[PDB]
Ligand binder design. Structure first.
Ligand SMILES: [Cl-]
Ligand SMILES: [Cl-]
Ligand SMILES: [Cl-]
Ligand SMILES: [Cl-]
Ligand SMILES: [Cl-]
Ligand code: NA
Length: 129
């Protein structure tokens, strides 16, 4: 599923991401924009052989099982395919674990390089929330 901007903001809020770990909703929407262009089915292979999955590009090296990332962990206790569903619950719940892990939203490279410090409230502007 390819979400619209305000549609994703609403779903993230319903799933408890707004202000989670202190990160306002616009941070999460901006991260999803630059990680996946709001496409739940996005996948991208990393040089190390791991793969990123879903709207927040969560990596099989630590967070989910894809069966093809040797030596990796599965800390969200999910198949990586769960991160591709049109329902964002699994991606949100796993993101909550990631952002609690120590480095906050810096875990998302696109967030650090493209969202951090910017006017992230623009990503929720106009949305009925
Ligand atoms: Cl947009
Ligand atoms: Cl915001
Ligand atoms: Cl594996
Ligand atoms: Cl959803
Ligand atoms: Cl933080
Ligand atoms: Na894994």
């Amino acid at each position: 599923k390819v979400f619209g901007r305000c549609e994703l903001a609403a779903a993230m809020k319903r799933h408890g991401l707004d202000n989670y770990r202190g990160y306002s909703l616009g941070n999460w929407v901006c991260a999803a924009k630059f990680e996946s262009n709001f496409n739940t089915q996005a996948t991208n292979r990393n040089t190390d052989g791991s793969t990123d999955y879903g709207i927040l590009q969560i990596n099989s090296r630590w967070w989910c099982n894809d069966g093809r990332t040797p030596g990796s962990r599965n800390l969200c206790n999910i198949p990586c395919s769960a991160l591709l569903s049109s329902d964002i619950t699994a991606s949100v719940n796993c993101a909550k674990k990631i952002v609690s892990d120590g480095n906050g939203m810096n875990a998302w490279v696109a967030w650090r390089n493209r969202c951090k410090g910017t006017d992230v409230q623009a990503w929720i502007r106009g949305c009925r929330l």
